[PDB]
C-alpha cells in the first residue's frame, strides 16, 4: 500500500445525491442502538464508515437518562458499517472520549480521541489501531478537536485542536501527523478570531478546513492548510450568506477578516466546499435554531464579500431537527475528480424535545452529482411518543 | 477476476428444489428483524445473498406501524446470508431508495436504489460499493426499477426502467451500465403496451427478462436484451396461460403482440424462463389475490398462442399468502448449464391481515432439478394473532 | 487444499476432556437463541463448529410453541461457531429440512438437507455452499439420514440414508459423494436388521458407522466402511453393554448378528468409538428414558459377547437429561493420531418437562485424553421455571 | 510468522492514558451482555481483546441470579473485540472452564481452561484453537492458574498454576509450553510462601509475575522466569508500599522473603512493574476493600525494603468499586520499547451490591505515556437501582 495524495480537483458540483442514511433513531426504539451524538463519515481504501460518539448506553436502556451530556467517562468514538444504525454488536471502539478525529492515510487509519477533566485533558493519538502519541493539555480548557474527519496527503494528516475559552481568545494549534507521530505543531495566524470544529476537506489546492466561531462570529473562519509546507492561513468565508448557527439575517455586505456580529456564545459545526464558481454553502434553515439543513451555490464566497445564492437544495425540512454538519470526501474512488460529500446529524430528543430524558441523533450523508437532481428531504423519521 | 460471460443454456427443468427460506416473520415476532418488502436473491461470485427494500423499523418496533406505504425516506436496499433472516444485525445497506436492482458482473456488484418525491426521482448506481453514476426522472412520475435481479454480460448489464403513469402509457428506457457508467440507453421498442418490475436471467440466447403490464394486461410482457449490441425486442407470453394476478381464467387461445384484457390497474411482479419445451411458468394461484404459488411446464409459452400445462409444481398452497416473485441463477456455479432460480414473497400483514399495523414478508426460494423431485408447499409459517 | 486422507489411527483414550459447551438454553432465556433440536459438531481445516437443525423461532419466541414437532417447513441445519449459540445473528444457514449430515473434504464442505411430506421427501446434496445434486424419496415414508457428521477420504464421502418403515424393516442405502455428485449407492448388507441415525468417524482402518435399530434391537447395529473400495459390512456390536435407550439390564451375554430384545419401536442416536482393546462405548445413564450419559471402556465390544466394561467416565448425571449423541474428529489437528470426540444433546422442555410448550436443546461435547483425567458431570443448566 | 521474542526494555512510564473501557454493566442493562468476571486483555499480532469468564447467561436473564458463585459448569474464557462489552453475539469461547490464561506466542494464541470439582479439576492446553494437551490436578485442592495472558519468548510460554490450600502452604508449579506441549514443569523455588493469580509481563530482562499471597502476605510475592534455560526465582516486592487488599496500613520497612503480616486468607489480583527506577505499582486505595485504583512509582520497590512513592495516578476513585488488575502489553507495536499496559476489573453486584442477585464486571484498560499527562478517574458508571 501507498499514502494516498491529493492529486485531484473537486468534481464539478451540480446537485447532491443520497449516499446514507441510518435511520438509528426509528430503528433504536425496539433495538440494541447505541446513543450517540457529534457523528461524522470517513473512508478506508475499501470501506466507508460511519462514525460517532458513543455515550456507553442503549436508547431504550434506562442510562440514556441524562445523555444531553458532552462529556463523561463513558463516551468513545466508534465506527460502523455505512447506513447501518451504530449497534451494541456492529459498533467498533477506535479510542475512549468526548471529542475525537479519524482519517485514513492509504496505508493505516489515525483515530485520535481526547478525554479527561475539563482542567486535565489529553488526547490519545491512535494508528493502525495502536496507541502512538499523547499530548496533554495545553490550556487547562477542555482540550477539543474536529469531530469530523482529518485528511491526509502523502502520510501527513494535519489535525486542529483548540484548548481555553469558548467564549474568548483561546488556544488553537494545528498539528501535523505521521503514522501518529507528531511531526510538527504550530499556533493559528491568520485573521480567524476563534476557532473549533472544523470540517475538513482535501484536493490539490491544499487542505481546506471550515470551522465555527463561538464566540461573536455567525460567518464561519476557515484555514487553509498546506500539508507539505506545513504551513496554514486563516480567514472567514468572506460572503454575507451567512452559515453558522444561531445567526442573524444575510447582509448584502460580509466579513473577510472578521467575526460578522449579533450572536456570541454559540454556533453549530458546519462546513463548505470553496471552489471558485464550484463553492457550495451548508446550513441549517432556521436563523434561530438547529432545525432544517440546506446546500446554497455561492460563487466564490471564500473571496466575494457580495456573493449570494445561485442555486440551492433542500437536504432537510426546517420542520425537522438537524445538527451538526461536516465534510468528507472517498479519496480512493475511480475517476479524474474527488466528489465532495457531506453528512447532517439529525438531532432527536433534548433539549429540543424533552418528553425523553435522552439526546441522540441519526446520520443522513449526501455526495455531489455532475447531473441536476431531483431533491427529497431526509428527516429522522423517528416519532418521539413511540419512547414515551 | 474476469466478467463473467453468458456461454451456458438453461439446465433441463424436471421439477423444483428448496434452496432458501428465512422464516422472516417468525423469527421477527422475537428478535430484531427489519420490516421489508420487494425481495430478491442474487448472487457473487463466492457467495448468495437475500435482498430487499427495509422500511428502517423492525416488526416488533412501533415504527412498523404505517409500512403498507411503498416510498418514505426510510427505505433502503439491503442484502444479507442466504436465508437467515433480516436483522438490523446483520444486514448490510447497498443504497438508500424504493426501488431497486442489483447484479455482480463477475468482478463487483452493482446495485441501483431510486428515491424522492413522485415528482423528481432519481436513481443512483453503486459499483463495487461506491456511487459512479446518477439517473434524474424523466417523466416526472415515480421512476421505478426491476426489484429483482439484473444481468450482465462481458461487463455489460442492461436494467429495465419505467418512469410515467401506471395505468396507462409510460417512458420505459432500457439502460446499459458497465463498472457502473452508462454506455447507452434506449426507449422501450416492440409490441408490450406497458412494462414494471422485470424479473431477468442470461444464457447463451442473451438475455430474457419478464414483466408486468400494469394498465390493461393479465398476460405478462417479454423483453429480450442482446447485451453485447446493446438492443432488444419486446412482447407478450403468447401462451393462454395467464400469469399476472389479479388475471381472467385461461383462455384457449393467448396474445403474443397486446395485452390480454379483463383486468386493469393492478399486476404483481413476476417471472419465467422461456426456453422451448425446457418452458416454466411461475404464477399465484388465486386469479383474485396474491395468494398460492405454482409452477407449470408449458412447452413454447412465449411463441404459442394455444399452449397449454404438461407438468407442473405446487410451491405455496392457495390457502398461504404469496406476493411478488422473480428469477436469479448462480451464475458462478460449477457445470455444464445455468440452473434456473426463483423466490417468492410471501407477504403478510397489511392489507389482507390488517388486526396488525405493519407489511411485512419472509422468503422462500427454490432452484430446479433434472430428478422429478417430491413436492412441498411452503408457507410463510408466522401466526398473526402472536402479535396482537 | 489437498483432498483429506485417513492415514491416522485413533489416539489411545484413557479418559475424556471438555472441549466444547454453549449453554444455549440458558442464554436463550433472555437472548435471541433459536430452538433446535439434533445438534453435532463438525469441523473444517480451519475452524472446527457446532450444527443442529433450527426450528426457525427463537426460544422466547410466542413461536417456540410446538416444537417437539420434528418435520415443519421452518426447519434448517445451522451452523454457529463453537461453544456459541445458536442465535438469530451468528447462525449460517446450510440447507433446508428436517434431516441432515454435512462433513468436509479437506477442500470443500458437502452439506446435505431433507425436507417434504411424509412420502415425498427429497435430499438435496449441497458443496461449497452450492446445490448440486438431488435425491427423491425411494420408499415414501420419511427419507431420513444421519443427523451427524459424515466422514471423507480422498474427496469420498459416504453417507447412510434410511427410508420406509421405523417399526419394521427398511430400504438402507449408502451413498458414495464427491464434490456433491453422486458416485455411487448400494442396498444394505449384512446382519443389521434396522439402521437409523448412524454416527461415523474414520481412521486408517476406514469409515466406522454407529447406529440405531428402531425397530426391535437394544444392542447398537454397526456399519464399516471402505471409502476407496465403496462398499460396506454390517453387524451389531457383540457386546452385552447394551447402548440403546430405553433398552433391557446388560445380560452376560450379546448378540453379534440380530437385534437383542426386550425393547421395540423406539431408541435414541447414539455413537462408540471400535478399536480394539481401546473400544469405548457412549450411553444413557437411565435404561428407561434419555437421562444421564455416561462413557464406558468395553474391550473388543464390536466382535466380543462377552465384553464388559474396565474402566469408565460420567458425563452427564442420571438426574440431568440427555439426549442424541454422535462422533466427530477434528481431521486437521497436528499430531500422529485422530482425536476421538463426541457431543452429547442436552434435550430441555417436551416431552419430559411440560409446564413449557418448547422442546429445544444445549450441547455439551468432549474430546479423548492420554492422561487418566478427573471427571465432572455436565448439565443443561437452565432452570424450566425461568421460563414460566 | 515467527515467535515473538522479548527484545525490547519497557518504555519510560511517565503516565498513564486511557486505553479501553467497555462500559459492559451499563449497557447490558438493556442489551445481551454476558455476565462475566475475573477479566483481563491480551493481544495477537493483529488485534488486542477483552478476555473474561462467561457465567454462562447474560445479566437481564434470571440466570445471573446466583453469579457471586465461583466454578459451575457454565463458565468459559471468552474473548471480544477491544472495548466491546461481552455480548452473546461477538463473543468468542476459547475453552470451558472457570480458571484461564491466554497468550499469543507470535504465530498462534495458548488458551488454557481449568475445570472440574474441587477434587478432580484439570487443565486442557489449546494452541492454535485446538486442544493439544492437558494436565490432571495433583493437589486435588481447586487446580488454578493466573486469570490474566501469560507471556511467550521464542515460542515458549510459561505459565504459573497452583493446586492446594488457599489458607496455607500450597503445590505451585511453573509450566513451560511450546505450541501447546509441555516441554517442562518446576516446583515452586524460592522465598514466596504462596502464589495465587500470577500478572505477568515480558521485556528483554525475562519474564515477571506479580502474583497473590493468599495465606498471610499483604506484600505481593514475584516469579521472575527466565523462558530461556526455563528456570524461576521468587521473592516478594520488598517496598513498605503494600499491594494486596485487604492490607495493614503501609509501615516504613517492608519484607523481601516472607508475608508482611496483619491480614491472613484473602487477598486480590494485582499487579506491577518492577523496572528500577521505572517502577510503578498498582493497588487499590482502600485497604479494607476491592474499592478505588491507583498507580504509585516506587523507584527499586522490588529490592529496595525502605522504598516511597515519588509520583501517582488516580485511575479509580475509592468511591468507585474495583476488583482483580493484570499486566499484558503489545509486543507487536511499532517502537523501540515495550509499552506496559494494565487492566482494572470493576465489579458490581454481590457482595457489595446485594440489592442485585448477580455479580459482574466491566473493564477499564490503561497503557503508559512518556509524557505527565493529566489524570481522570474511570468508574464503571452503571446505576444499581436501575436493575432494580
Ligand atoms: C425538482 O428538483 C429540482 C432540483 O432540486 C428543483 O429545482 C430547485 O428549486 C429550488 C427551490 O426553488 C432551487 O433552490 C433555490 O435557488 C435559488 C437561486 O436560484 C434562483 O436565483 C438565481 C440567481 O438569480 C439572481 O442572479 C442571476 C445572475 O446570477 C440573475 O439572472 C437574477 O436576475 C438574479 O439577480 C437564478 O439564476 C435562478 O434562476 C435559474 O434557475 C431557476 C430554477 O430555480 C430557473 O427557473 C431559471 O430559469 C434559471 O435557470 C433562480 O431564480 C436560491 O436563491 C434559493 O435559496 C433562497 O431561498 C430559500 C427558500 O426557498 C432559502 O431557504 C435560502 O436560504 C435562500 O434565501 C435566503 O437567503 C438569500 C440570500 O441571502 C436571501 O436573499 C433570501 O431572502 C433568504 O434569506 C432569508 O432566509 C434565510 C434562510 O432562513 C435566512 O438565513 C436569511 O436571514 C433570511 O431570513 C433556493 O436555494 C434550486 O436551485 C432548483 N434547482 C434547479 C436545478 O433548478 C425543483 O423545484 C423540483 N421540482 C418540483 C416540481 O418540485
Ligand atoms: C409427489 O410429488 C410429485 C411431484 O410433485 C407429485 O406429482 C405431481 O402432481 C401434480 C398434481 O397432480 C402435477 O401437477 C399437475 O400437472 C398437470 C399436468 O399434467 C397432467 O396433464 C398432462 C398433459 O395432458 C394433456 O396433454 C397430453 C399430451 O401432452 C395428453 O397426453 C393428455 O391427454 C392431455 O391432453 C399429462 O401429460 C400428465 O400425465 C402425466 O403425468 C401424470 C402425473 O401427473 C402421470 O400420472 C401420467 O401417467 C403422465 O405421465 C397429467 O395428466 C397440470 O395440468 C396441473 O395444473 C393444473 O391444475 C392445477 C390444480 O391441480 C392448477 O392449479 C393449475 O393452474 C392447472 O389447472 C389450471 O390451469 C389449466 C390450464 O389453463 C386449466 O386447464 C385448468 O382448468 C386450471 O385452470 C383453473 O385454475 C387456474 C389456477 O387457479 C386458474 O388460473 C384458471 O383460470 C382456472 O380457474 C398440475 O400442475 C405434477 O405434474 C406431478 N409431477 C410429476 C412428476 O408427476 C405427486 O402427486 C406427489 N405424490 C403424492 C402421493 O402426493
Ligand atoms: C476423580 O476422577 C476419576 C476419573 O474419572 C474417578 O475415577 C473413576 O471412577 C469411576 C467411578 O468409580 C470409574 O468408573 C467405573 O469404572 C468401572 C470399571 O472399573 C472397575 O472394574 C474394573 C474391571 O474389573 C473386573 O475385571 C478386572 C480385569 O479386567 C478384574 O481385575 C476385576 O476383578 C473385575 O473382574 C477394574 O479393573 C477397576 O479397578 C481399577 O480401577 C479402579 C478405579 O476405578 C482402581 O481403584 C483399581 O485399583 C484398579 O486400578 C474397577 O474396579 C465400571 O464398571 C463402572 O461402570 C459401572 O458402574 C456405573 C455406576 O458407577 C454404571 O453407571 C455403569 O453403567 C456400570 O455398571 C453397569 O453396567 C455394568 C456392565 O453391564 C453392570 O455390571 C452393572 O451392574 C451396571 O449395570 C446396571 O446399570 C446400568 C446403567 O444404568 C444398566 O444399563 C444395567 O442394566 C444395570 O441396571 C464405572 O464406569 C472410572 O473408571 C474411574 N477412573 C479412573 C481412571 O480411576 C475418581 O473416582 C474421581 N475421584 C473422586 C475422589 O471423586
Ligand atoms: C492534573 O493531572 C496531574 C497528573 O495526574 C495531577 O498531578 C498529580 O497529582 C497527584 C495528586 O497530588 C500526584 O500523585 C501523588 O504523588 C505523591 C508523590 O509526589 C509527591 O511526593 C514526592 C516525593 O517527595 C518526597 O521525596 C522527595 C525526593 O524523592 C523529596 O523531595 C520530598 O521532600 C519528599 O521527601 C515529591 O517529589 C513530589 O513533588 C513533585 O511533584 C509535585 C506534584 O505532585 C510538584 O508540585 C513538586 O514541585 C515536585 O515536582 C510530590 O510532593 C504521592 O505521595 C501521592 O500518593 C499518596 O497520597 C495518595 C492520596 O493523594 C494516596 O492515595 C497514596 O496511596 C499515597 O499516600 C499513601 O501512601 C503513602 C506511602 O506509604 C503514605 O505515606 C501516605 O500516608 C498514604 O498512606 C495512607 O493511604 C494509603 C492508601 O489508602 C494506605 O494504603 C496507607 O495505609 C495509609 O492509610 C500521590 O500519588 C501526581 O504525582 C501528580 N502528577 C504530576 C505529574 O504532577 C494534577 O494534580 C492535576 N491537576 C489538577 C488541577 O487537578
Ligand atoms: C415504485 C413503487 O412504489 N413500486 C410499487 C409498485 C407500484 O405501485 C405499482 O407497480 C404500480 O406502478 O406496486 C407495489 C405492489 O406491491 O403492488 C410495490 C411497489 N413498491 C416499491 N417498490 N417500494
Ligand atoms: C426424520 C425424523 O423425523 N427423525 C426423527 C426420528 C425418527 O422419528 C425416529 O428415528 C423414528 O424413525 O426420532 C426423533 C427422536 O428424537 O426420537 C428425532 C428425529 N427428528 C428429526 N430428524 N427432525
Ligand atoms: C479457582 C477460583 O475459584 N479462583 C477464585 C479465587 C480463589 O477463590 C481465591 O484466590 C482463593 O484461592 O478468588 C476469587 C475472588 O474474587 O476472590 C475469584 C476466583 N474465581 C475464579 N477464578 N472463577
Ligand atoms: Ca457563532
Ligand atoms: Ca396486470
Ligand atoms: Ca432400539
Ligand atoms: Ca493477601
Same mark, same amino acid.
Given at each position: 500500500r501507498n499514502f494516498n495524495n491529493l492529486t485531484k480537483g473537486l468534481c464539478t458540483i451540480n446537485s447532491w445525491h443520497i449516499?446514507? &442514511? =441510518? %435511520?438509528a433513531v426509528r430503528i433504536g426504539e425496539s433495538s440494541d442502538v447505541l446513543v450517540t451524538r457529534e457523528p461524522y463519515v470517513s473512508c478506508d481504501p475499501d470501506e466507508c464508515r460511519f462514525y460517532a460518539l458513543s455515550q456507553?448506553?442503549? /436508547?431504550?436502556? &434506562?442510562?440514556? %437518562?441524562?445523555? /444531553?451530556? =458532552? #462529556?463523561?467517562?463513558? #463516551?468513545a468514538l466508534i465506527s460502523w458499517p455505512l447506513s447501518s444504525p451504530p449497534t451494541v454488536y456492529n459498533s467498533r471502539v477506535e479510542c475512549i472520549g468526548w471529542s475525537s478525529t479519524s482519517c485514513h492515510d492509504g496505508k493505516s487509519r489515525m483515530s485520535i480521541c481526547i478525554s479527561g477533566p475539563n482542567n486535565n485533558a489529553s488526547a490519545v493519538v491512535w494508528y493502525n489501531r495502536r496507541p502512538v502519541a499523547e499530548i496533554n493539555t495545553?490550556?487547562? @480548557? /477542555?482540550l477539543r478537536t474536529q469531530e469530523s474527519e482529518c485528511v491526509c496527503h502523502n502520510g501527513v494528516c494535519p489535525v486542529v485542536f483548540t484548548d481555553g475559552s469558548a467564549t474568548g481568545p483561546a488556544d488553537t494549534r494545528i498539528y501535523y501527523f505521521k503514522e501518529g507521530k507528531i511531526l510538527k505543531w504550530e499556533s493559528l495566524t491568520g485573521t480567524a478570531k476563534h476557532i473549533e470544529e472544523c470540517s475538513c476537506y482535501g484536493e490539490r489546492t491544499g487542505i481546506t478546513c471550515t470551522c465555527k466561531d @463561538?464566540?461573536?462570529?455567525?460567518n464561519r473562519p476557515v484555514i487553509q492548510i498546506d500539508?507539505?509546507?506545513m504551513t496554514h492561513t486563516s480567514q472567514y468565508i468572506?460572503?454575507?450568506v451567512l452559515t453558522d448557527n444561531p445567526r442573524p439575517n444575510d447582509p448584502n455586505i460580509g466579513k473577510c477578516n472578521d467575526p460578522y456580529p449579533g450572536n456570541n456564545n454559540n454556533g453549530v459545526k458546519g462546513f463548505s466546499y470553496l471552489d471558485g464558481a464550484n463553492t457550495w454553502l451548508g446550513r441549517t434553515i432556521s436563523t434561530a435554531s438547529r432545525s432544517g439543513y440546506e446546500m446554497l451555490k455561492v460563487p466564490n464566497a471564500l473571496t466575494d464579500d457580495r456573493s449570494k445564492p445561485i442555486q440551492g437544495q433542500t /437536504?432537510?425540512? @426546517?420542520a425537522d431537527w438537524s445538527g451538526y454538519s461536516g465534510s468528507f470526501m472517498?479519496?480512493?474512488?475511480?475517476?479524474?475528480c474527488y466528489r465532495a460529500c457531506f453528512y447532517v446529524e439529525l438531532i432527536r430528543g #433534548?433539549? &429540543?424535545?424533552? &418528553?425523553?430524558w435522552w439526546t441522540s441523533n441519526s446520520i443522513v450523508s449526501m455526495c455531489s452529482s455532475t447531473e441536476f437532481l431531483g431533491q427529497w428531504n431526509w428527516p429522522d423519521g423517528a416519532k418521539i411518543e413511540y419512547f414515551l
Open positions: 449516499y446514507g &442514511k =441510518d %435511520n456507553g448506553t442503549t /436508547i431504550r436502556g &434506562k442510562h440514556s %437518562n441524562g445523555t /444531553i451530556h =458532552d #462529556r463523561s467517562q463513558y #463516551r495545553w490550556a487547562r @480548557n /477542555i @463561538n464566540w461573536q462570529g455567525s500539508p507539505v509546507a468572506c460572503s454575507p /437536504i432537510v425540512l @426546517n472517498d479519496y480512493w474512488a475511480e475517476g479524474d #433534548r433539549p &429540543k424535545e424533552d &418528553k425523553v
